[PDB]
Amino acid sequence: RFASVYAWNRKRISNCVADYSVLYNFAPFFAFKCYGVSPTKLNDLCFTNVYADSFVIRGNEVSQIAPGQTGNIADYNYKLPDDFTGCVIAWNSNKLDSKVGGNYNYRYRLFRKSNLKPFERDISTEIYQAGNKPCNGVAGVNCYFPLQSYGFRPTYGVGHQPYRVVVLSFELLHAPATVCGPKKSTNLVKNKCVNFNFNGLTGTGVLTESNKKFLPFQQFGRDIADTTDAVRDPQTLEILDITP
Amino acid sequence: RFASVYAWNRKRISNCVADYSVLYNFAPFFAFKCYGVSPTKLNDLCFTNVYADSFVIRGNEVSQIAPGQTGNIADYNYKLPDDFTGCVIAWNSNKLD
Amino acid sequence: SKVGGNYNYRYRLFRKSNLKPFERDISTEIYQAGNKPCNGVAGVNCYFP
Amino acid sequence: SVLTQPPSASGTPGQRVTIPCSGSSSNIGNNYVYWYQQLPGTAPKLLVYGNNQRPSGVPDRFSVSKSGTSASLAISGLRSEDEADYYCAAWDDGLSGSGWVFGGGTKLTVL
Amino acid sequence: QVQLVQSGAEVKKPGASLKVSCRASGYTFTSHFIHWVRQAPGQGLEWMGIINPSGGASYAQNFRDRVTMTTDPSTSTVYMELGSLRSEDTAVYYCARAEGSSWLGWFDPWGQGTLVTVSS
Ligand SMILES: *[C@@H]1O[C@H](CO)[C@@H](O[C@@H]2O[C@H](CO)[C@@H](O)[C@H](O)[C@H]2NC(C)=O)[C@H](O)[C@H]1NC(C)=O
Ligand SMILES: *[C@@H]1O[C@H](CO)[C@@H](O)[C@H](O)[C@H]1NC(C)=O
């Protein structure tokens, strides 16, 4: 049971090794648009938080799950930020989420005061007062119920079928990362020019014993002019200086 | 005198400011379904041609003034296109007609 | 086309099933259209192709 | 009518006749096919379904084939009961509508 | 031993309505959705509708706006109502039963068939 679009889930993904090769055994995926990353290189990167949102939508609105879009899904049901670096996955589920005789359990909000902020979730059911007069909880003329149920008969065109959507959104940067792909570690060598990767930091240089002190909250002190100069192993906590 | 349904009027609306805030001083409007537009935003949009059709019908056939409907009004008296972006307004007039 | 029949243009009218696109066959084996082999002698149920 | 079937076919008892039905990705390239037999003056019955399975009450002399966006039914050894109309069936999801679409059918007889 | 029986029908003037029955027997009524299919003579077949035998229904969109269905899971029957008939709707209607789950499935029991016609 995916949740309906006005009240979407949000699974926070904690520490793991994340094989994305899976997620490639579910269907043809009517879509699959990775935005900040390219999907062929996901199994070799470290991310800090991977937020997975999940909902259902009609088929002609799958193009509205994108950064900076308009229409009655992206304005006020689910707003992606313009600083987006995730991946939008969407596949048809007319064989599961739609029954004969109307499926009145998928609803979308069509009237609101104004738009949402990015990643904003509302579960309000207060009657939007369009007209100048109050109608005090009794809908009708110039004040309507805000959550309208979808249709999802099976005999609807593609473009009115229930499409399930999972939006992955994850940021890679400060802090550790916690969750990273399967890269298979490797023996650490010292005093040799090598090609190194320290939990996401890709570079070249000679590794040497340092004399700097990162405090348990520090992961890699760059130098003046903003270039990485020291790192701390990802499973030993040894501080090592780097130099071209 | 509204015209009967088989021979409906068609007023083409030329240049002129439409106080959308009016048309809200006529009754309870048994209906008022805006299809392509949402009626709270009408006072801030530009339209090119505003065609106003006008007729009378029985009360159980007001649901047939919609894009893609069947029954003896919508089949051959007045057919709305399936590319509709107007607004259907309907109110009782048993006290007049 | 000549007067008196031109018996040098032939077309295959019976086969097992269809061809693939751009498929060429020069078979002359007797198609068996029955439940009993006729071992290279055509006639009832099995015709020249 | 979106499906494509030959309008007629003929043969002799003891011959293998194939009846095809080719469609599209919406019609066939994304949803099993089913084969129904209409004998004249009756209701339709089942012949073959699911491209590998056959129901009861039928000899398995009828076979099913599927090549991409096409399918077909194969009949070796005709009898006098096989002068009938044959239809193939498939679900389809199209832009204008969706539903349970049929073939045109093929009338098969022996002179 | 499992059969879907109907009612014999007659000539009907165009623009009228037509309620036709489909009584199910021999098995569990609320276990199998019902297909409604239609065939004009000298033409192909086209299916009308699909019915939850205890629930709702859905329709083929080429034949929307003129067909209604109703279940009646006490005397084990479903019904088809077709109003505003035409002269090109002269056909025969079959009422088939489907597989126990949703729309995709085989159609194993079939109706006897009903003749629908218009004349003067
Ligand atoms: C991750 O697991 C590895 C298992 O190999 C840990 O490596 C061992 O850590 C212990 C504790 O210091 C050492 O005594 C062993 O010698 C290490 N193994 C090898 C092969 O060197 C590693 O410490 C773990 N990392 C974390 C952060 O828990
Ligand atoms: C939190 O606040 C934001 C904006 O102030 C609002 O959109 C959201 O609904 C709030 N969440 C809860 C659970 O109240």
mmCIF file with all atom_site columns, N, CA, C and O in Angstrom, chain A residues 14-32:
data_model
loop_
_atom_site.group_PDB
_atom_site.id
_atom_site.type_symbol
_atom_site.label_atom_id
_atom_site.label_alt_id
_atom_site.label_comp_id
_atom_site.label_asym_id
_atom_site.label_entity_id
_atom_site.label_seq_id
_atom_site.pdbx_PDB_ins_code
_atom_site.Cartn_x
_atom_site.Cartn_y
_atom_site.Cartn_z
_atom_site.occupancy
_atom_site.B_iso_or_equiv
_atom_site.pdbx_formal_charge
_atom_site.auth_seq_id
_atom_site.auth_comp_id
_atom_site.auth_asym_id
_atom_site.auth_atom_id
_atom_site.pdbx_PDB_model_num
ATOM 1  N N  . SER A 1 14 ? 19.206 4.566  6.853   1.00 0.00 ? 14 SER A N  1
ATOM 2  C CA . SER A 1 14 ? 20.363 4.581  7.721   1.00 0.00 ? 14 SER A CA 1
ATOM 3  C C  . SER A 1 14 ? 21.463 3.705  7.129   1.00 0.00 ? 14 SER A C  1
ATOM 4  O O  . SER A 1 14 ? 21.412 3.311  5.962   1.00 0.00 ? 14 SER A O  1
ATOM 5  N N  . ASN A 1 15 ? 22.467 3.404  7.952   1.00 0.00 ? 15 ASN A N  1
ATOM 6  C CA . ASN A 1 15 ? 23.719 2.776  7.551   1.00 0.00 ? 15 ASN A CA 1
ATOM 7  C C  . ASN A 1 15 ? 23.545 1.412  6.904   1.00 0.00 ? 15 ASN A C  1
ATOM 8  O O  . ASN A 1 15 ? 22.865 0.540  7.451   1.00 0.00 ? 15 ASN A O  1
ATOM 9  N N  . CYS A 1 16 ? 24.173 1.228  5.748   1.00 0.00 ? 16 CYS A N  1
ATOM 10 C CA . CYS A 1 16 ? 24.090 -0.004 4.982   1.00 0.00 ? 16 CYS A CA 1
ATOM 11 C C  . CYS A 1 16 ? 25.175 0.005  3.922   1.00 0.00 ? 16 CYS A C  1
ATOM 12 O O  . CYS A 1 16 ? 25.927 0.974  3.797   1.00 0.00 ? 16 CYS A O  1
ATOM 13 N N  . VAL A 1 17 ? 25.239 -1.079 3.161   1.00 0.00 ? 17 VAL A N  1
ATOM 14 C CA . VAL A 1 17 ? 25.869 -1.077 1.850   1.00 0.00 ? 17 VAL A CA 1
ATOM 15 C C  . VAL A 1 17 ? 24.726 -1.161 0.848   1.00 0.00 ? 17 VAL A C  1
ATOM 16 O O  . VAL A 1 17 ? 23.781 -1.935 1.008   1.00 0.00 ? 17 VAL A O  1
ATOM 17 N N  . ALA A 1 18 ? 24.746 -0.271 -0.128  1.00 0.00 ? 18 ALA A N  1
ATOM 18 C CA . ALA A 1 18 ? 23.578 -0.022 -0.954  1.00 0.00 ? 18 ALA A CA 1
ATOM 19 C C  . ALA A 1 18 ? 23.855 -0.482 -2.374  1.00 0.00 ? 18 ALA A C  1
ATOM 20 O O  . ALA A 1 18 ? 24.477 0.242  -3.154  1.00 0.00 ? 18 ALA A O  1
ATOM 21 N N  . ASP A 1 19 ? 23.390 -1.684 -2.704  1.00 0.00 ? 19 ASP A N  1
ATOM 22 C CA . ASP A 1 19 ? 23.556 -2.234 -4.042  1.00 0.00 ? 19 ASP A CA 1
ATOM 23 C C  . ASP A 1 19 ? 22.369 -1.737 -4.851  1.00 0.00 ? 19 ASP A C  1
ATOM 24 O O  . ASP A 1 19 ? 21.232 -2.148 -4.614  1.00 0.00 ? 19 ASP A O  1
ATOM 25 N N  . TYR A 1 20 ? 22.626 -0.843 -5.798  1.00 0.00 ? 20 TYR A N  1
ATOM 26 C CA . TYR A 1 20 ? 21.556 -0.272 -6.595  1.00 0.00 ? 20 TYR A CA 1
ATOM 27 C C  . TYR A 1 20 ? 21.204 -1.116 -7.804  1.00 0.00 ? 20 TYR A C  1
ATOM 28 O O  . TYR A 1 20 ? 20.236 -0.792 -8.497  1.00 0.00 ? 20 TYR A O  1
ATOM 29 N N  . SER A 1 21 ? 22.026 -2.136 -8.040  1.00 0.00 ? 21 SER A N  1
ATOM 30 C CA . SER A 1 21 ? 21.842 -3.085 -9.128  1.00 0.00 ? 21 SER A CA 1
ATOM 31 C C  . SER A 1 21 ? 20.465 -3.677 -8.948  1.00 0.00 ? 21 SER A C  1
ATOM 32 O O  . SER A 1 21 ? 19.792 -4.031 -9.910  1.00 0.00 ? 21 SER A O  1
ATOM 33 N N  . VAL A 1 22 ? 20.042 -3.822 -7.700  1.00 0.00 ? 22 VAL A N  1
ATOM 34 C CA . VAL A 1 22 ? 18.717 -4.342 -7.468  1.00 0.00 ? 22 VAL A CA 1
ATOM 35 C C  . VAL A 1 22 ? 17.928 -3.196 -8.056  1.00 0.00 ? 22 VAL A C  1
ATOM 36 O O  . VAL A 1 22 ? 18.418 -2.515 -8.958  1.00 0.00 ? 22 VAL A O  1
ATOM 37 N N  . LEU A 1 23 ? 16.728 -2.949 -7.561  1.00 0.00 ? 23 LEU A N  1
ATOM 38 C CA . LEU A 1 23 ? 15.981 -1.819 -8.081  1.00 0.00 ? 23 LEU A CA 1
ATOM 39 C C  . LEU A 1 23 ? 16.023 -1.843 -9.604  1.00 0.00 ? 23 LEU A C  1
ATOM 40 O O  . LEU A 1 23 ? 15.587 -0.911 -10.264 1.00 0.00 ? 23 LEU A O  1
ATOM 41 N N  . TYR A 1 24 ? 16.552 -2.926 -10.155 1.00 0.00 ? 24 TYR A N  1
ATOM 42 C CA . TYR A 1 24 ? 16.645 -3.120 -11.589 1.00 0.00 ? 24 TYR A CA 1
ATOM 43 C C  . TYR A 1 24 ? 16.036 -4.474 -11.884 1.00 0.00 ? 24 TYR A C  1
ATOM 44 O O  . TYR A 1 24 ? 16.445 -5.175 -12.803 1.00 0.00 ? 24 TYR A O  1
ATOM 45 N N  . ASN A 1 25 ? 15.050 -4.832 -11.075 1.00 0.00 ? 25 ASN A N  1
ATOM 46 C CA . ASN A 1 25 ? 14.362 -6.094 -11.173 1.00 0.00 ? 25 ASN A CA 1
ATOM 47 C C  . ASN A 1 25 ? 12.935 -5.836 -10.738 1.00 0.00 ? 25 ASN A C  1
ATOM 48 O O  . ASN A 1 25 ? 12.374 -6.571 -9.932  1.00 0.00 ? 25 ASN A O  1
ATOM 49 N N  . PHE A 1 26 ? 12.342 -4.772 -11.267 1.00 0.00 ? 26 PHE A N  1
ATOM 50 C CA . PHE A 1 26 ? 10.976 -4.444 -10.883 1.00 0.00 ? 26 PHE A CA 1
ATOM 51 C C  . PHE A 1 26 ? 10.030 -4.193 -12.044 1.00 0.00 ? 26 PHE A C  1
ATOM 52 O O  . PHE A 1 26 ? 8.836  -4.459 -11.928 1.00 0.00 ? 26 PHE A O  1
ATOM 53 N N  . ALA A 1 27 ? 10.563 -3.738 -13.167 1.00 0.00 ? 27 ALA A N  1
ATOM 54 C CA . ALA A 1 27 ? 9.723  -3.505 -14.323 1.00 0.00 ? 27 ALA A CA 1
ATOM 55 C C  . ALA A 1 27 ? 10.497 -2.720 -15.348 1.00 0.00 ? 27 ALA A C  1
ATOM 56 O O  . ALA A 1 27 ? 11.728 -2.751 -15.344 1.00 0.00 ? 27 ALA A O  1
ATOM 57 N N  . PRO A 1 28 ? 9.781  -2.033 -16.231 1.00 0.00 ? 28 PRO A N  1
ATOM 58 C CA . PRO A 1 28 ? 10.411 -1.226 -17.277 1.00 0.00 ? 28 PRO A CA 1
ATOM 59 C C  . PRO A 1 28 ? 10.575 0.210  -16.805 1.00 0.00 ? 28 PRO A C  1
ATOM 60 O O  . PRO A 1 28 ? 11.274 0.999  -17.440 1.00 0.00 ? 28 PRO A O  1
ATOM 61 N N  . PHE A 1 29 ? 9.930  0.538  -15.690 1.00 0.00 ? 29 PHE A N  1
ATOM 62 C CA . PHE A 1 29 ? 10.011 1.870  -15.137 1.00 0.00 ? 29 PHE A CA 1
ATOM 63 C C  . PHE A 1 29 ? 9.692  2.886  -16.198 1.00 0.00 ? 29 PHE A C  1
ATOM 64 O O  . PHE A 1 29 ? 10.579 3.322  -16.908 1.00 0.00 ? 29 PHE A O  1
ATOM 65 N N  . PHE A 1 30 ? 8.432  3.277  -16.298 1.00 0.00 ? 30 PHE A N  1
ATOM 66 C CA . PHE A 1 30 ? 7.998  4.271  -17.270 1.00 0.00 ? 30 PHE A CA 1
ATOM 67 C C  . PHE A 1 30 ? 8.964  5.445  -17.297 1.00 0.00 ? 30 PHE A C  1
ATOM 68 O O  . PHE A 1 30 ? 9.010  6.183  -18.265 1.00 0.00 ? 30 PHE A O  1
ATOM 69 N N  . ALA A 1 31 ? 9.740  5.604  -16.232 1.00 0.00 ? 31 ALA A N  1
ATOM 70 C CA . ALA A 1 31 ? 10.726 6.665  -16.141 1.00 0.00 ? 31 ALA A CA 1
ATOM 71 C C  . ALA A 1 31 ? 11.891 6.162  -15.318 1.00 0.00 ? 31 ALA A C  1
ATOM 72 O O  . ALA A 1 31 ? 11.964 4.978  -15.016 1.00 0.00 ? 31 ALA A O  1
ATOM 73 N N  . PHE A 1 32 ? 12.795 7.065  -14.964 1.00 0.00 ? 32 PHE A N  1
ATOM 74 C CA . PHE A 1 32 ? 13.980 6.764  -14.170 1.00 0.00 ? 32 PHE A CA 1
ATOM 75 C C  . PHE A 1 32 ? 14.953 7.843  -14.533 1.00 0.00 ? 32 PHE A C  1
ATOM 76 O O  . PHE A 1 32 ? 15.808 7.666  -15.379 1.00 0.00 ? 32 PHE A O  1
#
